[PDB]
Enzyme design. Sequence first.
Site, PDB file in Angstrom:
ATOM      1  N   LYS A  88      -5.209   7.337   0.256  1.00 43.19           N
ATOM      2  CA  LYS A  88      -5.556   5.929   0.423  1.00 43.19           C
ATOM      3  C   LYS A  88      -5.811   5.541   1.856  1.00 43.19           C
ATOM      4  O   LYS A  88      -6.550   4.565   2.104  1.00 43.19           O
ATOM      5  CB  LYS A  88      -4.443   5.044  -0.136  1.00 43.19           C
ATOM      6  CG  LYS A  88      -4.451   4.997  -1.661  1.00 43.19           C
ATOM      7  CD  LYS A  88      -3.483   3.932  -2.167  1.00 43.19           C
ATOM      8  CE  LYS A  88      -3.566   3.775  -3.682  1.00 43.19           C
ATOM      9  NZ  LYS A  88      -3.569   5.069  -4.329  1.00 43.19           N
ATOM     10  N   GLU A 110      -3.982  -6.524  -1.606  1.00 37.86           N
ATOM     11  CA  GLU A 110      -2.971  -6.678  -2.638  1.00 37.86           C
ATOM     12  C   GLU A 110      -2.485  -5.303  -3.074  1.00 37.86           C
ATOM     13  O   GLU A 110      -3.135  -4.283  -2.827  1.00 37.86           O
ATOM     14  CB  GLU A 110      -3.502  -7.458  -3.850  1.00 37.86           C
ATOM     15  CG  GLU A 110      -4.074  -6.585  -4.957  1.00 37.86           C
ATOM     16  CD  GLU A 110      -5.577  -6.433  -4.871  1.00 37.86           C
ATOM     17  OE1 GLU A 110      -6.239  -7.363  -4.367  1.00 37.86           O
ATOM     18  OE2 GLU A 110      -6.097  -5.385  -5.310  1.00 37.86           O
ATOM     19  N   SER A 378      -3.699  14.573  -4.480  1.00 40.85           N
ATOM     20  CA  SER A 378      -3.944  13.283  -3.839  1.00 40.85           C
ATOM     21  C   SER A 378      -2.768  12.834  -2.977  1.00 40.85           C
ATOM     22  O   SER A 378      -2.968  12.208  -1.931  1.00 40.85           O
ATOM     23  CB  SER A 378      -4.268  12.233  -4.898  1.00 40.85           C
ATOM     24  OG  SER A 378      -3.332  12.268  -5.961  1.00 40.85           O
TER      25      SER A 378
END
Lengths: 399, 399, 247, 252
Positions: A88, A110, A378
């Site tokens: 991310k 958010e 990931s």
Amino acid sequence: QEPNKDGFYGKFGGRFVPETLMTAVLELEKAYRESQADPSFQEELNQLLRQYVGRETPLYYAKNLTQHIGGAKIYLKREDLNHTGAHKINNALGQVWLAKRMGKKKIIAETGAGQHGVATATAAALFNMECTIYMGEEDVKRQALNVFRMELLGAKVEAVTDGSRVLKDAVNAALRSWVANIDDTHYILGSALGPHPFPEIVRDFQSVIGREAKQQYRDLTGRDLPDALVACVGGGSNAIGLFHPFVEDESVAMYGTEAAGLGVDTEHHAATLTKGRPGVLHGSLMDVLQDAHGQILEAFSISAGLDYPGIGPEHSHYHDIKRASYVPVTDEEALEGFQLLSRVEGIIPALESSHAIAFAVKLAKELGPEKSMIVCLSGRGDKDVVQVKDRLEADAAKK
Amino acid sequence: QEPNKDGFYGKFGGRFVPETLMTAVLELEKAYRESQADPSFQEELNQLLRQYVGRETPLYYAKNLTQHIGGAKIYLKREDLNHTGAHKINNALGQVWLAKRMGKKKIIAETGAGQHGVATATAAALFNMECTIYMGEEDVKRQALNVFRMELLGAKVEAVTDGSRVLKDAVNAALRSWVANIDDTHYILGSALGPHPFPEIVRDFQSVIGREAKQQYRDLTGRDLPDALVACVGGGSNAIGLFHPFVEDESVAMYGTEAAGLGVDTEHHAATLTKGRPGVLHGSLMDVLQDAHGQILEAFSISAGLDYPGIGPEHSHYHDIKRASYVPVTDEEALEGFQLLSRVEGIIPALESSHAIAFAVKLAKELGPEKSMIVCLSGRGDKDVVQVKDRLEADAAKK
Amino acid sequence: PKTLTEKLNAIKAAGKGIFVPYIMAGDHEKGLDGLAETIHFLEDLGVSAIEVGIPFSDPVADGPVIEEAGLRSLAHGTSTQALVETLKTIETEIPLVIMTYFNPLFQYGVENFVKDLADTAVKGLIIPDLPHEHANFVEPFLANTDIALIPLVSLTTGIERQKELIEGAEGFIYAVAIRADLDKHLAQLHQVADIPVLTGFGVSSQADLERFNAVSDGVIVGSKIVKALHQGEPIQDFIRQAVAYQK
Amino acid sequence: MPKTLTEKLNAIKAAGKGIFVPYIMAGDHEKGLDGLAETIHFLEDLGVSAIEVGIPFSDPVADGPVIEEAGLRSLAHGTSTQALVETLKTIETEIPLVIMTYFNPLFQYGVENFVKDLADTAVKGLIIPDLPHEHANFVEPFLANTDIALIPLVSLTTGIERQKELIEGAEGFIYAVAINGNYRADLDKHLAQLHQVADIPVLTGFGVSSQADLERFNAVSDGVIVGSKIVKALHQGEPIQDFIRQAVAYQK
């Protein structure tokens, strides 16, 4: 084009947003093209990804796991070794840098579980930008540790008391704050969802996964291309970042592992492409779990990062033209993969990535020891040790 | 030499272990010389550190932190980006790979906080070797998460029930196991503190930190050498790994930060070189905290990874010949360094490394803008978030 | 030719088995003031020598019973300096073998430790964590003295390693082991040993003391005697039968 | 050729009267859609200009918290586009109805099916808040040669060039929306500027909670849309009937 002028990947995508939000996404697309035309933008980002995040992440041949399955060779793209411990950060750092080029000073986002909130807050502290993370109040009460993490990184966490006080209410609160403060605030979407140009921007910033793996696989194995790619799929950011650099290599198969939850035919799953159909949600025309009248159904998964009812438009496009396959992986299957990789390779994977590991052992038996695959690992699993320990302990006394 | 044939760095070191243990140490030194003569041993170890651990870790120019302090340029050697999140894995991997060459099948070690236990269990899993981590029962009941971590990685956690059930008992339980099964078992010493040849072996496996940093500083800045090196000291592994490749460069100053607890002049600290004198403990002649009658005192620190009564003998040598300065850092200064790096650079540091950050702030102001320093960021502080959160909430309530 | 060597060679020549109890200094109700009472108690039983331990905070070669006695002794404030002062008032015919880990000895000073014990009954010294490779820290200070440095030998090591540690040894040899496989190692050691060899295992009954008298020259008892004196249990008759055992 | 809704609202404007359009959520009633006839005739007997009728959707993006709750209440009864169509075919009223729906329920039902099934009803307009001008090709072709006007939404803070692009050829009325809500004097100027370049009635959809708010917006536009105040009152059993009478009777 992919995406075309109006943001469609084939039949999917677009910007189905109110006119009040149309101004922000138009400005964002314009500022994005200007950053692509500037070579100094990608150079500063490349160096920061190298010195701060630690790119490039290695492509590790999981020798033990490969010998254990007795099937195809498994190569793990070690995105778990990024700063913050997941992929991310690639998108958030790229979007904060874009926000600095736009002349913005505030960063907002958010989050539900807290992963995207930590990555966004990390990228904001690197660039000395004010950060506000919107969370539903019921999520703030359940994630006191991640709230402390985001505040440790200098971010303000704004609890959303409106409505059900969950992620659905934090999204609206963040979007309303984005429009209201457009002249100095940029909203960082966390996944490959949302209106154009967000799926395109998230894909490009995550394409460092696949572009590195492609060149690493050749320098490592001496072969041209792997036979298959595997990644887990929430909104689709890490999967599309691995797939897209290979999209024109027809011999390379692609598999996205969906969260099947308690079972594809049960009431608690998140298998968007297995049980869903095209609809308009979150500003994008995409496959989404929904009833016969168009109401969005709740998604369930043992991994909070995969419980989304929809999926990125580019993945729906891939699924439509049969470029990629999308396979359900159950809660229990992901638990086996979590424990398997830990003891066989010494890598504790995230519960999200454990869905890809679980299907990786399935695909490995199918391809045989003459083939090779690249699995996107990931994230690391430290954020999931507490949940897994309780689940295995609760099931021990009960069985 | 350094060390000579007897295992002495100047006046410190030695193999002060019983004769039952001397055979294990003499076999270890013999086999270790064989691994240094075989080029394939480093070629293999270099690739695994690259593919599996993630080396080389970047040397990060902490731009925000440097401008915030206003003095010397601060470069962070990012050992927090290693797999497992710390530097320990460098030593556990080399020693397990050394045990693989020796024909061993079982790996053992002891741990208190759990960090060396996790690192050792990670390395053993990589090479498909049995692992048993000896842990005091009082530590086992307090570190349920790290015990589950070690079990996730396939290691057995042996709860030592004998004696006072602390780290002191676990060392004995682990060393007795090593001699009884010397034909098949190898013992991993966690830090640079112990009988020869352990301090030399640990220094060399950890020298990748300072060896990479020396070249990375030249590649990044175009300059020749940094002006100073800063690192925190427990037993001394991460500090000597940063210091040793620079030892022959006189213009490079060296600073090791000791845990000062509530205060050096109090009864709860761990400043070995500040308040200790040479003694014989853990099979080595070193500086150690002790009373007038030779009894080893207990060390206290906010960071449990630094509460060791002694220090590695090569640091005692560095300290004696004025090669390195050793400065104490209180818990309060480290707690602020923990929050300073998290907010200014978006990097959550380990409480151990927060001692290095705290002193680097002072030293950067003193050296001035014309100078440069390399600080070893020995680990990441996810493992310390819970503790810091409770500490900050307790300090706000009392005051 | 030191006293401890000749005293024990006489016990071996007289057909008796060498018996060396192992006590911990300061492990008493009165602390170090009861040491004279403890040594004189064992003297009336005719023991060959007396091993006296100095309590250390981080022992490495002590059992759970001995380590429990060392902590019991640290409460009363037992230190090396406090034991040397007490040994200056100890008058006895039994040779004393001081056991200590090297750090309490290193801090006090090796030379100071020897010079301050010259007129005492200290005839032997055991330092478990001081290997043969660091004998120069102690051996030069024991020349022209009546204190013998006791070497410890692991039975499972090579015979060339054992003969290396026994060369020139005085007092006795301490046999340690990491059950019938040991008898071959301990008899081969007794073959190449010029001074007596002693076994410091966990002998609990009379059969254990006799099992090693066929191969060694005597046993060292600690846990059984330390635990008996603490719990107020019979030990006085067990020591009589062990001394009077004929070989 | 001309849509009915344009002409009906011009008649209210011509009589020196402000256009008053209540907004209700279909199915937000004790007996669900079975209360829709009652609510419409209740508002019809108060003389309102048109009635905005909402289709509840599980993930709204443009409604205030009162309307969001009304959608949740309505979905509990199982309110669907299909069932609303069936209800609207039995609704007789002289008031023109304006369907408000987010695009997905309409998209699932089929836009053509929706338009053709509502051919002989009181449905005269259509508001789709999340179908922007850039995606109007999903609905606009199917509205040709019908009596259903696609209501465009305009953000007052945008440029006049962008606003005129959204107005081009619009029928029914223009729905003026504003982000959030000194600042209020700039709204009236931006709102009055849209009233000039516009060729059909311009209605304000902002905060209308009193007669003073209604008369303020009539100075710069042609009328108001009131939603939250009426939805909250009808559900909580609060008085609202007299507020609508004074609103309808307002003489420009």
